Amino acid sequence: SMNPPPPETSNPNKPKRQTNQLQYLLRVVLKTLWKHQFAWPFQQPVDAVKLNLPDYYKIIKTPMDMGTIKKRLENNYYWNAQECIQDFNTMFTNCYIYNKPGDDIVLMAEALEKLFLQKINELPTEE
Numbered sequence: 001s002m003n004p005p006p007p008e009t010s011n012p013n014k015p016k017r018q019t020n021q022l023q024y025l026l027r028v029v030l031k032t033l034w035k036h037q038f039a040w041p042f043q044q045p046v047d048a049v050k051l052n053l054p055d056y057y058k059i060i061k062t063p064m065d066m067g068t069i070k071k072r073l074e075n076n077y078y079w080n081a082q083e084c085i086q087d088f089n090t091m092f093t094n095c096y097i098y099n100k101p102g103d104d105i106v107l108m109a110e111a112l113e114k115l116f117l118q119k120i121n122e123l124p125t126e127e
């Protein structure tokens, strides 16, 4: 009945690299999603103590949110662009998993996911 600690966002012992892909994922993909009208419930970890969703962390064992993703990109936590893509997909599917078809929050996630898909369509190619 407590929240878990948020996902890890730093690790100064992971080797770091910059790539066109990871730069795009921050400066275009994360940025565009963050500014979307439906982004606000996805900008931080689900707070199941403030929100009254008590079974949330019984159901969602791989939490993810765009606040975390932003930190991970900023701290060069990701080596492969796909690690970041995976985290966006985990965020969307967690919303689908906890909730049910037709729920307002699921329609918000679906809209954000469609946007995600249009932006990643233009991801630069891997090195």
Ligand SMILES: CCc1cnn2c(NCc3ccc[n+](O)c3)cc(N3CCCC[C@H]3CCO)nc12
Residues within 6 Å of the ligand: 049, 050, 051, 052
């Ligand atoms: C307005 C501030 C706020 C936002 N969430 N939240 C919650 N969340 C729990 C929750 C969620 C859904 C239904 N219910 O019934 C409770 C409790 C709570 N408070 C209870 C304890 C005494 C203080 C009082 C305000 C804080 O100091 N205040 C807040």
Ligand SMILES: CCc1cnn2c(NCc3ccc[n+](O)c3)cc(N3CCCC[C@H]3CCO)nc12
Residues within 6 Å of the ligand: 041, 042, 046, 051, 053, 095, 098, 099, 103, 104, 105, 106
């Ligand atoms: C990724 C965030 C998330 C996942 N589930 N969920 C729920 N689920 C409950 C539920 C049930 C039936 C219909 N709907 O629409 C939702 C609500 C909720 N929030 C409260 C309502 C305003 C937005 C938003 C704020 C806090 O993240 N946020 C979330």
